[model samples]
Target chain A: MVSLPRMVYPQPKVLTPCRKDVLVVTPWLAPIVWEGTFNIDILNEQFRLQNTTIGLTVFAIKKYVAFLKLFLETAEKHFMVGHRVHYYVFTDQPAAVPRVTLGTGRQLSVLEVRAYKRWQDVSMRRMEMISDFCERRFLSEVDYLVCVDVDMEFRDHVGVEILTPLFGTLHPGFYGSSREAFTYERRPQSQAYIPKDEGDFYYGGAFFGGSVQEVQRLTRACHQAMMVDQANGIEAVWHDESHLNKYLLRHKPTKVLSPEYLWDQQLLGWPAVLRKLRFTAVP
Target chain B: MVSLPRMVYPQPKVLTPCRKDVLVVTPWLAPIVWEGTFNIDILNEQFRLQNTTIGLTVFAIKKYVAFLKLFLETAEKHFMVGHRVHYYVFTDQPAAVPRVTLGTGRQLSVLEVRAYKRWQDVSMRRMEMISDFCERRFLSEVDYLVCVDVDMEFRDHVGVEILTPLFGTLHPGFYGSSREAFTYERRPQSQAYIPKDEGDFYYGGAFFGGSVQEVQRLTRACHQAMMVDQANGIEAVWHDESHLNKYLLRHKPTKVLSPEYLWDQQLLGWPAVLRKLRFTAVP
Candidate 1:
């Protein structure tokens, strides 16, 4: 009788359950905030702000007015809903644009940073500044800090509750399919910090909620690692997303935002109108 | 003399581009297609009339009647400026649902298919039916067939020209960041065929063309290959998306849609009001 071949079984597909700690961060590369609303005659002279950083990239100046409108509208609604709000606006052209006046009558404290021209520069400058700013300034003041691009308009104000209890959450926006290249399925066998199967919070593009101290610590770690890689002639896969994946894999955040918060425009069908209209119409 | 070991090269991060073919055959589970509309009552019957294949699985339902009421009214003002004349609709309950009687009183034939509970059952059944239906039924009847979901509310009806020779200059939706694990980038790839790049015609859950024969041929080839994999034991990363990706990748389609034709509701801020709203605006 022929000897039976040794039985070998394939590994089962494993998905690491993502934790809850999250912060929503999107890049709002706009040249100016409140371009249409800002009256040059009134606010330019009356709104005297101090020690603020403003930013505007070349692209943001030309292509981002629409996004700015949406962002401001959403932020105002959030503020109206009794959420402590801080607008950390990042742009390249700070000197040219006027200050952003929010509903509370207090101008938003603008965080100015140079826009990275190359993709690598994003991690080096924009991402680095974001982490550093959160750690040095806002970390002690706020319980949670979320960094999001201005392009995203708010569908609901419940997004304010996302920061409670101070842990971060990665919002799953679209339901189509996850990009495997960006995902890790199994634990790393070696000592590398980027672990497999621990990628519940994969993309750092949008996130929410984490203690000031904890987020500051995580931000410092990420910045230091990115700087080291840059000095050693290394580059990341998705620039900031890769750095975030590596960090979150080892130090899990406190929460993952329910997919409802960050619905990608492409995936969710037309009902987004109701989402936008309802929120916009709120007094 | 032993030469110093050549500077050892660190293993380049092995980004195993996802298995694209597997993705094509085994689409992600829970493929729900919810319809967001402003007038659910008007669309409810129409939605019921829309048809889907037996293999397709719909997980959730949303009607944006309130949202659509405002949107379609505004959209009507800018109709046909740079838009298509026809739009496609997909539904599981096409027969009992009310028909979409266009303003011109022209009504398209409704197609129907049974629903499947399990994903495997859905895929197996789709493989058996999709090809025959495309070749035998749709080919000879319509001049052009644009594949679309019920959620896609169009701005203009100029969609008819999408079927002409001038329309072949569109990007297939499944390019770049859209590919999946089942789709292999290089040679000696998986059993199922997935594209390395999105090519010209991406399967963005929508399609447009002037020739029914052309679409039929494309759909027929895809349906055949998918059927061959019925017991071939492979699953697609995306449903219909996988099949469309394969078909469009191999056969370059000749239709393009402007952003106006399929404006995703999420991107456009909600309409402020629905003045002069009518239940049968499109009808």
Candidate 2:
């Protein structure tokens, strides 16, 4: 497995943080798991011993197919390098999906799905589709599932440090803003209603992950929640993102990633707080 | 016991975080306790049930004794208000120690020691004293130990969220600086020699804490390393802070606090990153 260079001086030990300034753990006892928080050598050895396999799911319908090449190529170069990786692409046009070369112990699969008319349906259907695929394929195939927006690309290292039962990245737009200012679904009629006074953070829908069971649980819950909202003749604000926030609020994520994981350099210029821009929106 | 106002919705659950953005665990599976990362109400219930006692150690010699009154009063108002607390005042003059009234389930003790001629000896003696007292008094008297410099005051709430097996606060000056730029002890002859490339962070000597056992381990290790350096006739670059950086490097702390735990508003004005100034240096 590809691992960070082994350090001879600061010998590997448990509970020792690589960075003292940034917290490696949260007060509620969830691991934040930032860069410098873990020794990759130790983590790589542990994951490799388990023969870890990571499944990445992305959707590309119509124009979104154009994003596949750069996304897959950059992912091969940056995302989960040494470990076994399976890129599961859900697309209407399987033939249009780009044939990108992957590193050792990595593979790709393109699954065909019917194209939805409205953009909202396509976005909301992603949860249902991922949940469906989790039962059909992901269970036997991979140990963990990382679901992300196809429009995004890996800019820096996105590795096993992010692997957790359930993890979500901070939305770059609202990370520094107060919880009251977060653009959550405000209408009480919506199932995704988060009261103005109630919110820990604005989590971006572009990136999220967890173990296969937890990912399935999250996707299934979100899909069910969306269906309930639909039955009530109401749609949530920000669509899937609003439901995601609500789910995370009720069932708190095991790991909360910094904004470095999900960023838009164009919309929000590089801030001093972010030391690395790992996964970013394509211009 | 003093507790945060109870929330109406999402009735408090054990191990659930107040803020969803932060994490509750580390990558290596250590509990990271941070502000807003926990429900104070639940924590208070658990701690009070155990009858947990916290021992706070502070050193004051010569002119530094003047910092005791405000420190004690402010601590009563903000620091560990609800938990059973014992303030351990180590000073050359026991009579100079302030008689600030503490709340129920709290008390104070003054230990007298001969005043040192050099400021360096006074500083270095703190670790030796705490380590010695850990076996003599702390193990029997308190569940945890919080060691701090007397030249500071509590600005905001400093509560149970910070209680951990072992924790170190980020130094205000070096939190943002790169490892290579950290003012670590550079002399190889001294035991505190941390190579330019090797350092997670430069932790301040002012504020740090842990369980009795862990605090004893840290203080003993640091004191022994300092004795070795003294035998070799070498004083570190930043004295106690340099030795502290080295000790933490070898034995990684369980929890690492943000700069908000220790700050100097006079030298560095409040930055956007710090949501609350819990403890600060008085100019």
Candidate 3:
């Protein structure tokens, strides 16, 4: 509903694909965002005019709390640069959170959550995650909520191109893998199970979000499904990420961010197809 | 927010572009619809799940009413088949309206208005255009309103793939032309003025529409702007189309239809680029 101000870029040609090497749109008509698919100048004007506030939420748990500094510093350099941003850092280490300076109209809030020492126990703590996020702050503070992992840094521009009603980034590893070979929970008894024949691109949990309402809805949904699996005494193989996949499978995303949005450069070497890596796993 | 039922389609390759010859997305990330860019099966399920109702309006004043028979007949063959549709025919000759056999869940109503013979005075009848459109019937009857020229016929499948909050079709004659070459109203005295440097694309007036509220807003806006031009003793070069372009310039559409949605086979020869001519100019 935001009216764009007059600005000129090269007009889009109906006969030319913006990104020739990649599938840039889903079969359902949602854009599968990749580099060269968007113009940031126009996006900035559209979002800035609306005074859109994007809330960036990251959870730094246990030993991973150490990665917050680089994440914040690099994000300040590349993410949503001229727009209003609110960074909500959920961690048990408020004392360890680095005092990184933020740009104007951008603020950081250190939100403390109980630390789960073991990785497996963290799956059960979804109750805490769901209840805390279901609060009123999300509704009032931001137009969109971007949930990311702490162990990632912005290596290039990661801005409004990914914003939509609901969006999920393609898992870096499975960009070329077949759906039958992808690692979705195969157990039908579990709520997180995705059948062998079904599933779109595998969406990574490390980076995914959307409009605050959508994000909250997804969060609540994933938690309830996880609780259902717990009662049956059958946890999903990938736990939280497994539940995330199931939720997205039933509820399609409005946009699907390409692997360029999230990558593990050290393990998965930069490919010729990926023009620029926007966000990456910390080595 | 609606959830999709489980369905299987071939997984999209992140490395293959759907349409190599055409730009599939806008600078602000809205999809510019072409044939291969969407799957109608998916689109149908999405809209049908919402129980969407589309109201198509056509003005056939005086002799133009002659086109209504073939128009409605061809539309029955191609437009929104198996889905709910309401055809609103605004013409003086209600008795002349042909009794076209409609499919299940499809209906039509003849809405009578004054017959303006002179084409020039028709522009002044915008008050009738604006008020009749700004009624409770539109609000209560349909989810979206499709305003189209009566002198056209459906040649191929035209379905829910074009449904969006607001959308415009690219003009067939100017799809390849530069913004400077577009026929936007150049007179600054009129509210429809667009500088030679401005404009994304020249949009056709025959095929464009949106959600009922947006269509009403656009209709009212174009009328107010037209009234302003009238008071100044000037009319835009393209009249309604000129103001339509200006309105779209300030308020960018959520989606844009390629010339495939509306074309003239008689005037513009069939180019290799147009795979499907959904609607065409009537002789």
Candidate 4:
């Protein structure tokens, strides 16, 4: 009997780690992973360090439970190593959030912050919320903080070599796509409007910091400018991106991470560079 | 300060009754309607029906308790009319079936049949199972057996007029550009292909029948032919659609119903006809 070929499920390639080991940070301190919606084993194998602080917000607990699973599973796998990690989980729904214990006998501190509506609403403007969280809560401690979206997953550990120098770079998230496309891409900028000298590498989704103090200063500055712009009737276009652009245009961070480190999943298998920068090689 | 526009919640539209009425018949005894997911009031008001029956086959008394809520709700709304309406319910889930009591004091008689499993694997292939069920189970009863999908909601009473000689037709459920375009449009015809003469009208998602006996005979013939074809290693690509189209080709129905009756939600626009046809005009 002639045999039919077996179907193959392709695994995504990971990026190689940079020389300096990185500490990745995310904000998801809820315990809802028991639903088995995500796999965290791969994440633990990648990142050298992982940090999470509970977000003090109340929108919809059940609605975002799925994203929390993805965040915790990925963090546990990629960055939970032999390090003193702080998992500051804040929520009105403490019951729903899962209690995560680190393998190294590390403890997680459940902090309760005053749940504010303004913070919760503006927090959706990710960069602004992240900057505020770092300044108010984590500024005094930690050497570096890698700000990442809760929905994002690292294929492999990418460290200091890629993130350290870009601590002050202000890349506009929607710098190259039209406002119309922004609804779908979530970052809108028109190619016709962007200058050719800047190339196309300008998105505000991911951020890296050089040190604790530097990020605090930069973050505070960005938040102040963002608030001022809001007062001046600057409709929160690209929310945090608007604020990040304003700061970067003035301060000029040391390094600008390539679009490669922060790529969109929708544009899969398009260009040659994507294949070259496989996630498997990262950490 | 300029105030933001007041948010307007959508109010479900109550469609104006069409000149014709429609009767929805299923041999599956009692319907499963997700309370919050769908609004039954809209359905009751829209489809002016003669009767609706729940066809629950042989079920032990214990098994019928679980489905009592759904059965009672459907029967109260559809079977309470002053007539000897048939509720044709069939079930392998005998324990889950309910003994429906229509408000008129008429009780539902359970009809038992061997469970059919020809199209159990894939959900999209369910129409074929229903076709087989109609053929094997309730072939002799009603004048016509409308095969409306369980997920569908009747927005208007156009169903009554739909059975008229003008548009009462056999649909493969494939939509073409126009009434004429459907009949002559040809493609690379395969075993499951609809011929150029008939074109595509319905997408095999739902169908309307002329008479109970007629639909029964047609359903049985098609089911038998399809089972034979499957045994011979020639699986009909479109499940019952292959047989339906072949039977329809040999013997066309009175008239063809417009695709508007079974339109896809993904498609754009809400013209007058579509607006009138929308199952949930407000949502």
Q: Using lDDT as the measure, which candidate wins?
A: 3
Minimal lDDT window, size 10, model 4 chain B: B23-32
- Given the true complex, what DockQ would model 2 score? 0.09
TM-score of chain A of 3: 0.95
Give the C-alpha lDDT of model 4.
0.37
Q: What fnat does each of the candidate structures reach? A: 0.00, 0.16, 0.83, 0.00
Give a tens-digit lDDT track for model 4, residues B168-255.
2323222324433343213333234444334323324244454555565555556666556555556655566556655544343433
**Candidate 1 DockQ vs. native:** 0.01
Stronger candidate by TM-score (2 vs 4): 2
Q: Estimate the TM-score for candidate 1.
A: 0.34
Give the per-residue lDDT digits (tens) of candidate 1, residues A91-154.
6554534444565432355445665577566656655676677656675455456655555666
Q: What is the C-alpha lDDT of each candidate?
A: 0.37, 0.79, 0.85, 0.37
What are the runs in model 4 whose C-alpha is more than 4 Å off?
A: A1-62, A80-92, A105-137, A163-201, A275-283, B1-283
Categorize the docking of model 4. Answer: incorrect
Q: For residues B1-283, what per-residue lDDT tens digits would candidate 3 score against the true structure?
A: 5777888787777677888998888876778888888878778888999999999989887798889989999999999997899998887789989889999999998887766675555885643464466584878889988888999999999899889988999999999888888999998898999988778889988888899888888887888888888878898998899988998888888789999888999999799889999899996
Tens digits of per-residue lDDT for model 1, B35-60: 11012222222222332111111111
Per-candidate interface DockQ score: 0.01, 0.09, 0.73, 0.00
Better of 1 and 2 by DockQ: 2
Candidate 1 vs candidate 4: the TM-score winner is 1
Q: Which 10 residues in a row give candidate 1 chain A its minimum summed lDDT? A: A26-35
lDDT of 4 by residue, A1-283 (tens): 0111212222111111111111011010001111111123322222233342211111223345445454555455554343344444544455666655455634444434345567424543444444566766665555455555444554544333332323432122332343333321122231112122222123353444545555656566656655555555444455555455434433334344433345554544324323322121111
